[PDB]
Design an enzyme around this catalytic site. Structure first.
Site, mmCIF file in Angstrom:
data_model
loop_
_atom_site.group_PDB
_atom_site.id
_atom_site.type_symbol
_atom_site.label_atom_id
_atom_site.label_comp_id
_atom_site.label_asym_id
_atom_site.label_seq_id
_atom_site.Cartn_x
_atom_site.Cartn_y
_atom_site.Cartn_z
ATOM 1 N N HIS A 77 -8.001 -41.222 7.018
ATOM 2 C CA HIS A 77 -6.729 -41.815 7.761
ATOM 3 C C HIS A 77 -6.975 -41.782 9.228
ATOM 4 C CE1 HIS A 77 -5.894 -40.482 3.841
ATOM 5 N NE2 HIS A 77 -5.900 -39.273 4.152
ATOM 6 N N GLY A 496 -3.849 12.777 -2.694
ATOM 7 C CA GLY A 496 -2.831 13.775 -2.892
ATOM 8 C C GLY A 496 -2.392 13.936 -4.356
ATOM 9 N N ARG A 497 -1.433 14.947 -4.803
ATOM 10 C CA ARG A 497 -1.323 15.227 -6.297
ATOM 11 C C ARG A 497 -0.215 14.026 -6.847
ATOM 12 N NH1 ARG A 497 -1.223 21.339 -5.415
ATOM 13 N NH2 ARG A 497 0.290 21.192 -3.650
ATOM 14 N N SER A 498 -0.057 13.963 -7.997
ATOM 15 C CA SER A 498 0.748 12.981 -8.669
ATOM 16 C C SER A 498 2.287 13.143 -8.353
ATOM 17 C CB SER A 498 0.713 12.870 -10.148
ATOM 18 O OG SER A 498 1.533 11.763 -10.981
ATOM 19 N N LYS A 502 2.203 8.416 -2.749
ATOM 20 C CA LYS A 502 1.228 7.741 -2.279
ATOM 21 C C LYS A 502 1.044 6.461 -3.294
ATOM 22 C CE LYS A 502 -2.226 9.838 -5.356
ATOM 23 N NZ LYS A 502 -2.211 9.078 -6.423
#
Ligand SMILES: CCCCCCCC/C=C\CCCCCCCC(=O)O[C@H](COC(=O)CCCCCCCCCCCCCCC)COP(=O)(O)OCCN
Lengths: 700, 69, 570, 49
Positions: A77, A496-498, A502
């Site tokens: 074009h 980190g822990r559950s 996070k």
């Protein structure tokens, strides 16, 4: 190189609108391999422009408003500008050479095929969303107004023929039998034949045209409905069931079934039945007053019956939605049903729901039958009254036998559309409820973004500013005062822990979680204002579940861009350490995975999803416990390849095991939704009383 | 034809074994307190509409027989 | 075979009400026949000779005749719908009971939308049955009374109508099969659209987490366009059929008008007789007209029956009813088992021989591709071995009741799927009327009570989807509670601790002696630290047993692959 | 008459084409006028005969 995108960018620069080529390519180049004419026009319409391809002769090329785009069949074009008189020269904009060039008449005639695209700037200045009701069809009727005027004309003519055909019977009864007749009888016969055949043809044409136009309107409505459904927030889907929304959508099929039927044509015939009333009053006003008084009886009966039927069909739809939800859930989770022995419980629930649904349907049928019988009673009573009055009129005078027969046939033609509508009362009320359900889906706010501007691409600068987040409006606070800043090209480990919070950062970087207080920033841009697609298309996230689609391996890996090369797919599969198992398969990359990845193990589809996230070029890459579901001798390859996967990207690794983030630039430790420690690995392990050291010793 | 022969064979076979498909007769209260689907399956038509239809049909028959003679 | 002979026993079971409906239909036909006779009487003996008292008699008789006819028609419609509702309820119950008994290979090879559409065909059948389609058939069939009266009036016009009827029959025969084919195409497109919609709504999280809205929208656009085109074709054919019926009706109307005019001119027929004949001819044709506008309903109920047959004609893994074999003691043994995923796929297990005693906590370890993951799906009779026999408590599983076996055995997988219900509704799925204290005890055993404590709604918290709204570890703990809340004689842990962190796994492992109390527990996991406290650890390599014994009995010798795996894990 | 749905028939209902097409026209634009004029001329030639 796609030149249509460049031409669109140039023409948008000319008309004072900002366009991001990446966003337009994402939205309107779904299958790759260039834009194409239809998608180019749709993209131009998206930027609040007015475009249309026209057939323009070179002689007429002097009277159009430049600049204009010349679309060639091959992707070569060029933008035409400043068609110069007195020198037969054209100042095109060469899209390949990327600069204006001056041409003469001959090479322009060689390069121009006879089609040009005219571009105008028509930006609508209006911000508002209208509630979805029956008023949504008014703009549709306005758009398709030529067809509806045509059908109105056809309806008027059909009424004219239906008025003619009583008159021939009247003439036969009053002249052919009274005096005599053989010459006139044949004329009446042939005229009746042509009238009935042309009436049939006209009715067929009207039905065809009306059905076509209503089908197109329903297609438009369905497209809008699916756009809005995909634009809805994830909170909408998290609080509902699949069957509910599925039934709401099949109400579209209900609407389509209604639109391409005899309901609207019967309504048109009923409204155009005043043509017969003139002749009926001409015959005898004493008889026509009966019909004029009967019509309010029909209206009152319909008004009385309709709300009860609406309530019954509301209950019926509720039961239908419950049945759809139960059926979809049972079929989807058939593995769990068969693994346990919960078949008797499922059958008991199904039996209860089926009994309720059938009872509701029977109640609806009973009320429909009652309404139909009432309308039939009104019609028959009117017939008896007219018969008695007509008998007196014919015995006394001022009325003939043929006139009475013609009046009876005219009254029958008046009342037939009412009976036809009464046969489909349930459909009318069901559509009245289908529109409400489609509104329930369509009146929910979509993912809101105030910024209509096209933000540029993403550099990996993520910033959390005083983030406070809750799962529910009154649930315990997950993140209290999270403040964070991540620079471009930085590998970040979050541990980190559950329950430490996070797991909410991944769905906060994406606009899935809305912070109660604070704001999350990408490149200094607040995400509460940005277009969600812009953020999602540039962020690669690998979760722990990673559900796939019922397609082949290469279709699932290259879902975000089907037009890409196979070699990059192989490279991405090698990076994720999955090429091997895919090859061990008989079909290789053409193996269908089944529903939700039924044909592959958990680790297999985990690696497939890792490759799917890596196949694009994500500015930000997130690993949310991705390698936890994997085993050994597969996560090791993941780490060895991640040594070079994180090159040029801002990578965030959220893991439970502290050995995963050992080789990160920073390690952010979280405890009960607050950042307690941050630093390198050894810098955090130096303090034995820290949470990081405690977790490291505990896991070791 | 041929399909109608099969349908008639099935109809005759299951019409000879008739008088075993019928469910036991029960009162209305006992029909009401059944499993949800079974109380739709086993509940017969109410008696009032049956008497209304029978009364209308008998009225027509009586009118015809009295008018003819 | 379920095609149409299934409805014959249903019809015969309700024969005593269907015969009554037939008699009511013939009485309705007589009631309809009454009125044109009254018009003929009015036209021949009231308008001609004299009098108004006879007119009053006719009017007063006609009023009550009409009222009775309306009431009788309403009653017949009500009774027919009531009778057919029971038939469709029976069909629905049977269909779902058959659907739940199908083998898992049936569902694994198909999509959800296919089955969902095949079951909505049940609703289509129900709408056809509970409607005014068979009543019109009855009205059309019981119209020979009108023919007898018309033949009494005039034989020529009656012959004209009698010859018009085969025109209707031939037109229907000609125009039906193409409409059925178009509706087959429409149903196929509808099934595809339903499958796509279900798949896209189910996986909305991945559609929105990625940015593939344009791809989904393009697929939806193409599917919708095709479906609407098919619907338009069906509508066009239906309109053509209706117009073809109207053409025959009006042609015979014109022929009757001409012949009746010539008859009345030549005597031997009055004008009122002609009017009554015309009304009778219209009343004969009206059922045909009313049936010609529900043509799609007939073809669609045929197609829905065909699809219900497609669902209902597949074999079932239903039952093995022989002596009601008693409960299970946890004794599992394998004898010369070899298993192949497909007949044209590589072999996994070759000569796996095993024997597990009651109350024995046995751990099975290995690497990826070792074949240890198929044992759990072999114990439940999901995977059928190539040759050999799996014996539980001395009895072959290939001849036992599948529901009994799978009820006695509880399995926790690497990833578990819950339902869109509350937590307690998922834990007590196998017995919803069970005491809440048992649910709480099971949740405490699995360590699931702690994380539920931080939920505002409590045990009434609705799991948003299959597993949405809960994390992986929470889902694993909920699945463990669901498995433990019953009293399973055999427990299988198939990597049921991968999603758990160290704290949750430690809490679960401390309760392992309460979990394993009195049950045969088989532990399958990639990590070697989970089977440390097992009574016997088994190592598999490429579908063969290479090592077995206690952990130390295997850890003592570095020559074993168990020591190598433990060294790599550390 | 019984031809299956082709791509030509499918493209007529594509929502992209319907979005681009403004002021749409019916598939049979001049048939109604042709039939009405035919009816009028047949009527006028029957009246004179
Ligand atoms: C055995 C005696 C049976 C006699 C039955 C005679 C029936 C004559 C047919 C009447 C229907 C005419 C209605 C015209 C309007 C129909 C709607 C319409 O316009 O559809 C359009 C017109 O279609 C037709 O041509 C209909 C012609 C009917 C052919 C029947 C021939 C078999 C006769 C034996 C379709 O357009 P498209 O192909 O989809 O593009």
């Amino acid at each position: 190189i796609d030149y249509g995108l460049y031409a669109l960018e140039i023409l948008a620069q000319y008309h004072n609108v900002s366009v991001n080529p990446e966003e337009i390519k994402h939205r309107f180049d779904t299958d790759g391999t260039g834009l194409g004419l239809t998608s180019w026009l749709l993209a131009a319409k998206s930027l609040e422009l007015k475009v249309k391809q026209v057939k323009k002769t070179i002689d007429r090329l002097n009277f159009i408003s430049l600049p204009a785009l010349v679309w060639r069949e091959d992707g070569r074009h060029f933008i035409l500008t400043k068609v110069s008189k007195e020198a037969n020269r054209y100042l095109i904009f060469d899209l390949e050479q990327r600069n204006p060039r001056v041409l003469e008449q001959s090479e322009f005639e060689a390069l121009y095929q006879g089609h040009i695209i005219l571009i105008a700037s028509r930006s609508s200045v209006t911000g508002k969303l209208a509630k979805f009701d029956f008023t949504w069809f008014i703009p549709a009727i306005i758009k398709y107004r030529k067809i509806f005027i045509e059908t109105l004309v056809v309806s008027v003519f059909l009424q004219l023929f239906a008025l003619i055909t009583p008159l021939f019977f009247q003439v036969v009864m009053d002249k052919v039998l009274v005096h005599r007749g053989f010459s006139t009888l044949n004329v009446i016969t042939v005229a009746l034949s042509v009238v009935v055949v042309f009436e049939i043809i006209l009715s067929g044409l009207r039905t065809y045209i009306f059905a076509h136009s209503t089908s197109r309107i329903d297609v438009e409505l369905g497209a809008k409905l699916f756009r809005h459904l995909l634009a809805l927030p994830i909170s909408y889907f998290e609080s509902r069931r699949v069957g509910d929304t599925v039934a709401r959508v099949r109400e579209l099929d209900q609407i389509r079934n209604f639109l391409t039927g005899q309901a609207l044509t019967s309504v048109l015939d009923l409204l155009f039945s005043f043509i017969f009333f003139a002749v009926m009053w001409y015959y005898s006003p004493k008889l026509t007053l009966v019909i004029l008084f009967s019509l309010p009886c029909y209206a009152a009966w319909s008004v009385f019956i309709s709300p009860i039927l609406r309530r019954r069909l509301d209950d019926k739809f509720s039961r239908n939605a419950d049945n759809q939800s139960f059926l979809v859930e049972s079929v989807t989770a058939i593995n769990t049903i068969k693994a346990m022995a919960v078949s008797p419980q499922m059958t008991n629930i199904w039996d209860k729901q089926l009994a309720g649904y059938v009872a509701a349907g029977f109640k609806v049928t009973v009320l429909a039958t009652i309404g139909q019988q009432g309308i039939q009673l009104i019609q028959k009573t009117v017939m008896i009254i007219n018969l008695w009055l007509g008998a007196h009129l014919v015995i006394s005078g001022d009325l003939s036998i043929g006139q009475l027969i013609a009046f009876n046939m005219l009254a029958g033609q008046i009342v037939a559309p009412v009976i036809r509508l009464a046969q489909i009362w349930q459909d009318f009320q069901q559509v009245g409820i289908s529109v409400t359900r489609l509104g329930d889906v369509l009146n929910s706010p979509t993912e809101s973004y105030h910024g209509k501007l096209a933000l540029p691409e993403i550099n990996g600068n993520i910033t959390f500013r005083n983030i406070r987040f809750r799962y529910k409006p009154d649930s315990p606070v997950i993140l209290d005062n999270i403040n964070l800043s991540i620079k471009q090209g930085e590998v970040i480990g979050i541990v980190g822990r559950s329950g430490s919070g996070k797991s909410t950062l991944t769905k906060l970087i994406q606009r899935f979680y809305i912070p109660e207080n604070g704001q999350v920033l990408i490149d200094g841009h607040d995400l509460a204002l940005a277009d969600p697609n812009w953020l999602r298309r540039q962020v690669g996230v690998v979760l722990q579940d990673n559900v796939l689609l019922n397609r082949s391996i290469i279709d699932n890996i290259s879902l975000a861009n089907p037009g890409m090369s196979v070699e990059k797919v192989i490279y991405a599969a090698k990076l994720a350490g999955a090429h091997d198992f895919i090859s061990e398969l008989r079909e290789g990359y053409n193996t269908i995975v089944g529903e939700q990845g039924a044909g592959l193990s958990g680790g297999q589809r985990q690696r497939i999803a890792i490759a799917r996230a890596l196949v694009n070029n994500p500015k930000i890459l997130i690993f949310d416990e991705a390698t936890s579901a994997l085993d050994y001798e597969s996560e090791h390859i993941i780490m060895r390849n991640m040594h070079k996967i994180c090159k040029g990207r801002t990578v965030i690794i959220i893991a439970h095991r502290l050995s995963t983030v050992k080789n990160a630039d920073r390690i952010i430790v979280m405890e009960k939704g607050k950042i307690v420690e941050q630093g390198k690995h050894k810098e955090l392990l130096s303090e034995p009383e820290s949470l990081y050291s405690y977790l490291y010793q505990l896991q070791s | 034809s041929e399909f109608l022969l099969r349908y008639k064979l099935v109809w005759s076979e299951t019409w000879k074994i008739r008088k075993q498909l019928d469910t036991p007769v029960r009162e209305k209260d006992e029909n009401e307190f059944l499993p949800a689907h079974l109380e739709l399956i086993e509940t017969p038509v109410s008696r009032r509409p049956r008497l209304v239809a029978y009364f209308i049909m008998g009225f027509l028959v009586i009118a015809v027989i009295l008018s003819v003679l």
